[PDB]
């Protein structure tokens, strides 16, 4: 099966601050050595629901997987609804190897004193919107295996930073659509 | 068949300010979960071929469609050149059923009075560039099924919003290139 | 076989000041009327791995392909590792077809004196971020079938153009995700 997805309903699956305050919309479809994926995030409850001016302008979102491109349990994403697409919902309460969907090794290398400096090509930076309101940008950042967390196998992480007061306001982003190469 | 388009000529097929003064390249190819999705827009005639100061600098271009997927009449794009690919023209006159390149119902739900704020998710921001100039800015925003003009089951949007002053140039923008989660 | 790509290892391919002073990581995968492409550049040797206040801030790599939509060897990118995909390298010393990937010549025409301006479409514009960090964009610049170079049937080009100071960083830059039009 060709796509692993959070499923598209809103019920919270994801921590920004505290467990399952918020849904994270993630939707990965292989295209051969390529995933396309699709990725935002709402905030349902917690800190992140009405922010204030001291929450923290700076979330990282972590996926860890295994070495079968399983999720840990340590992500910040939960496992209950995170598996390969069956309608709007997912296939069942199961560990289906996933490999073909992680992010190649050799593109996208963990870090290692090795070399200091990782390759920038491991990193997508954009801007999305919070509220989808034109005048105010977020920077996602996505992330390709950088994570040892856990002794994760490979890693996709999400980091949301801004710099204005979007104080009393729901955090809450337009979708962003990226690619990556794959292992096999 | 995999892709819907408007074929890649440049003969005018979309209304921005009158009918037919424009063209719109949309591209929206199957990727199983997701389409997608490439768009640019361009002004062959009318207000938007030559703009001047006071020119409004937000044109919305509208893609309303039915319950089997076929583009409503009313739409701003013309249904005569819109069609499933057939070499690098459309496979006929004809109307066919196009359900999986709709946009997913559950993660793109239609405004309802049942919750105020829609979903963030249901658009995508970003800029493309007036003139091909890096220095024109323009911002585009995709919007699924946030239209009920007509009884639409289904809708994408284009919008465009730019604040610098580009009078006595074309309306012409750089490609886009997008994704969404589709319907079944 | 639906992807080329440079491979994803990091030896040297490229000339952005000098002959293989640099790796390109593109991979272009087939995706029916459409490629999804995937970009990034590093300068490994040469001006560019420890710029100066002087190092020019506009770099073009120029893809250019015959008529089989092979490289020409007059462009910026090194022939050998530049093939179809078989594991994390490629299939064989050999001059593989390759139409199916090349931009489609009428989304995307050559220039022309017919008319005076190009079509905006033929570009996709947005930023990258070098060092993967988030307050220094660079302007990347994707151009299809623009060069006339050598006879060149088919083009791509990757220009990045900056305007802050990078002295002393060595050039490397956050990956970017594209799609465009296919030729058959």
């Not at 099966?1 to 598209?8: D, F, S």
């Not at 935002?40 to 629901?49: D, K, M, P």
């Amino acid at each position: 099966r060709r796509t692993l997805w959070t499923t598209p309903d809103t019920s919270p699956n994801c921590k920004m601050s505290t467990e399952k305050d918020s849904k994270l919309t993630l939707t990965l479809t292989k295209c051969g050595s390529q995933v396309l994926g699709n990725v935002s995030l709402l905030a349902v409850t917690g800190e992140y629901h009405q922010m204030t001016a001291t929450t923290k302008k700076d979330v990282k979102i972590s996926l860890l997987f295994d070495e079968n491109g399983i999720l840990l349990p340590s992500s910040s994403l939960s496992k209950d609804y995170w598996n390969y697409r069956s309608d709007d919902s997912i296939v069942s309460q199961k560990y289906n190897n996933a490999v073909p969907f992680m992010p190649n090794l050799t593109a996208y290398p963990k870090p290692s004193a090795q070399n200091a400096k990782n390759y920038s090509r491991t990193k997508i930076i954009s801007n999305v919107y919070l509220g989808a309101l034109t005048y105010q940008p977020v920077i996602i950042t996505i992330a390709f295996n950088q994570e040892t967390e856990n002794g994760c196998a490979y890693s996709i992480t999400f980091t949301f930073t801004w710099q204005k007061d979007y104080s009393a306001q729901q955090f809450d982003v337009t979708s962003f659509t990226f690619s990556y190469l794959t292992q096999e």
